[PDB]
């Protein structure tokens, strides 16, 4: 259980400043090992950003800095830029059962446009799909920012986690974000419940849509 703990998300506006903590345990930072930082832009390999706690590889601007005191390492980014938007991972050698440990990662969002709540459209299974002996509820989530949502499905009022697939948000052409979630059911399941709900949580607020088998 050698572990490096990072906050899941940090955010700042362009030109502002953020810090990303990386809290260790006795086997890693606790044992004196150095911490290193990696930047990963969407669709690319991770890039070394800071090594040996505080050193910068050539090509890494001085806006990025790292420190390590006690059992805590930290990455500081000043003068935030939109190209800084990425996942950041801390890592170290360790003494435990593993030799190398990565932190869980921190998504940095650079807040260059205003917050937008998601628009949610919930489609019931089509007639054509039902006559094919299947039923898929389609929850489409559009026009939101920042690009992070959590989706929860409800059968009547009870949670359903089985048969759920959800996409990671991606940019619409209008530069806001969209995502989708699917609930697969037997036509029997669809018919046996009063109604079904897609609940989308975005920045601590939940927008919910509901469909029922009996309504047109």
């Amino acid at each position: 259980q050698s572990v490096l703990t990072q906050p899941p998300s940090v955010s700042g506006a362009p030109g502002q400043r953020v810090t990303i903590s990386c809290t260790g345990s006795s086997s890693n930072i606790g044992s004196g090992y150095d911490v290193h930082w990696y930047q990963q832009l969407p669709g690319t390999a991770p890039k070394l950003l800071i090594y040996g706690n505080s050193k910068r590889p050539s090509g890494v601007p001085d806006r990025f800095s790292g420190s390590k005191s006690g059992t805590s390492a930290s990455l500081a980014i000043t003068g935030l830029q939109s190209e800084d938007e990425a996942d950041y991972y801390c890592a170290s050698w360790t003494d435990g059962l593993s030799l190398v440990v990565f932190g869980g990662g921190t998504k940095l969002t650079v807040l260059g446009q205003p917050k937008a709540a998601p628009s949610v459209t919930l489609f019931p299974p089509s007639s054509e799909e039902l006559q094919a002996n299947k039923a898929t509820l389609v929850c489409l989530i559009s026009d939101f920012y920042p690009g992070a949502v959590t989706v929860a499905w409800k059968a009547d009022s009870s949670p359903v986690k089985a048969g759920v697939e959800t996409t990671t948000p991606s940019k619409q052409s209008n530069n806001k974000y969209a995502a989708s979630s699917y609930l697969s059911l037997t036509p029997e399941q669809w018919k046996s419940h009063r109604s079904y709900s897609c609940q989308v949580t975005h920045e601590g607020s939940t927008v919910e849509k509901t469909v029922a088998p009996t309504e047109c």
């Binding site: 459209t121 389609v138 989708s180």
Partner: protein, 213 residues
């Protein structure tokens, strides 16, 4: 220039064996350890293991011990990651990187491994019917393999309001995606909407008209 170059993307089926490679250039490969890292789609980096190519010393994460074999052939500057029996859950990006005084200063470009029991299969296309003055409608492109599919609306003439989502890989081993367009409520019935679905791998072309209830 120090580089690590990995073998190309793989599409395999459960139970099949697979060996992917990580080739070093521009440095003495024998003298630096190579780590392997898994990244599930949308998830974080997971250390899988590491090998000292000078003497073949290998250590694995407890999570990967017995699931995978890391090896190396120093005479040709290559490290490998090998499965005897792939699982669908092995679907991920795999990176190699070298340990160095600047640790993991150099990474491979990654190898995408897709594991699915599916044969090539064309999608079933289902209409998503419309129920501030605009209506949302679309098409459900269900149960296809492999990637990709192309979706257009009205042969390309309708592009405004259109969003075509990325695919989900389902537990069944098949992909599904959806495509929506926002259109004026008053144009319904009068204006006709057709999604055009192209799946080259199976030579499937479907035209599905989407109409109100």
């Amino acid at each position: 220039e120090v580089q690590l170059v990995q073998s190309g993307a793989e599409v395999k089926k459960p139970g099949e064996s697979l060996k992917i490679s990580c080739k070093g250039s521009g440095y003495s490969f024998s003298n630096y350890w190579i780590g392997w890292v898994r990244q599930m789609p949308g998830k974080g980096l997971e250390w899988m293991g590491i090998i000292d190519p000078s003497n073949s010393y290998t250590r694995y994460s407890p999570s990967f011990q017995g699931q995978v074999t890391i090896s190396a052939d120093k005479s040709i500057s290559t490290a490998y990651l090998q499965w005897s029996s792939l699982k669908a859950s092995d679907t991920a990006m795999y990176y190699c990187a070298r340990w160095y005084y600047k640790p993991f200063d150099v990474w491979g470009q990654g190898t995408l491994v897709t594991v699915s029991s599916a044969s090539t299969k064309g999608p079933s296309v289902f209409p998503l019917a419309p129920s501030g003055g605009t209506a949302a409608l679309g098409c459900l492109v269900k149960d296809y393999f492999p990637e990709p599919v192309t979706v257009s609306w009205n042969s390309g003439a309708l592009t405004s309001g259109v969003h075509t989502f990325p695919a989900v890989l389902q537990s069944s081993g098949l992909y599904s995606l959806s495509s929506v367009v926002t259109v004026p409520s008053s144009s319904l019935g009068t204006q006709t909407y057709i999604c055009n679905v192209n799946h080259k791998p199976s030579n499937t072309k479907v035209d599905k008209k989407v109409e109100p209830k």
